[PDB]
């Protein structure tokens, strides 16, 4: 299994699809995205890598994207899917029972609270209950088949609040808020906890990391990462967290850091071939 990073933005939206091999340290250059996109999200269903939403920021235009695209590692080809009902830049996504939930994001100055669900076996999107909060730059994680939306930016304020979607009741419920306000953080599930790493609080890019325990309903803070970063990509590979790229207020980072939970330590393990922020990332 490899860590795939798709899209991103290094002063313009990017088409790169690259795959990292934590074992031999190699970066594999795969098929370009059909359209350059940043602020997208990545996920995996079946063995298929999906790129969701984002925005095409190009020297001749600036269009937020409703698109869903599917990459097959067995053919090294991209294929389009049915698009979401609205464009969603700085989207969050989670996977539950083989269905892709697209959460939040922006379309122009519209900041979405709407959420929609993609079924790959019918190739179709349907709207579910909207969030309690408009969130762009929202982190999304799935724990025990419940969908968590964490932090983000509602158009006026950045958020430390988090809410939880129950698919069986089609309703959102507020949970305990994070310790720190974070937009553009990396949010993932590791072991049985939700991690929120980095982000932007409206004043500084953050290196802090905190994890939510459902049993205690408490957001604990763990060892901070080496480099402050917002709009970072994040994923879990072989029981460790990987954060990729991001923006630190000056530079688009190519640093990749890896978190080992048994030692509560962050290690810098590789550099991307080129610095970038707002990537989608997944493992397949």
From Swiss-Prot:
Effect of mutating residue 9 to A: Loss of interaction with NFE2L2/NRF2. Strongly reduces repression of NFE2L2/NRF2-dependent gene expression. Loss of interaction with PGAM5
Residues annotated as signal peptide: none
Tissue: Broadly expressed, with highest levels in skeletal muscle.
Listed transmembrane segments: none
Domain of life: Eukaryota
Impact upon substituting residue 90 to A: Loss of interaction with NFE2L2/NRF2. Abolishes repression of NFE2L2/NRF2-dependent gene expression. Loss of interaction with PGAM5. Does not affect interaction with SQSTM1/p62
Function: Substrate-specific adapter of a BCR (BTB-CUL3-RBX1) E3 ubiquitin ligase complex that regulates the response to oxidative stress by targeting NFE2L2/NRF2 for ubiquitination. KEAP1 acts as a key sensor of oxidative and electrophilic stress: in normal conditions, the BCR(KEAP1) complex mediates ubiquitination and degradation of NFE2L2/NRF2, a transcription factor regulating expression of many cytoprotective genes.
Protein family membership: Belongs to the KEAP1 family.
Protein name, per record: Kelch-like ECH-associated protein 1
Originating gene: KEAP1
Span of the entire protein shown here: 326 to 609 of 624
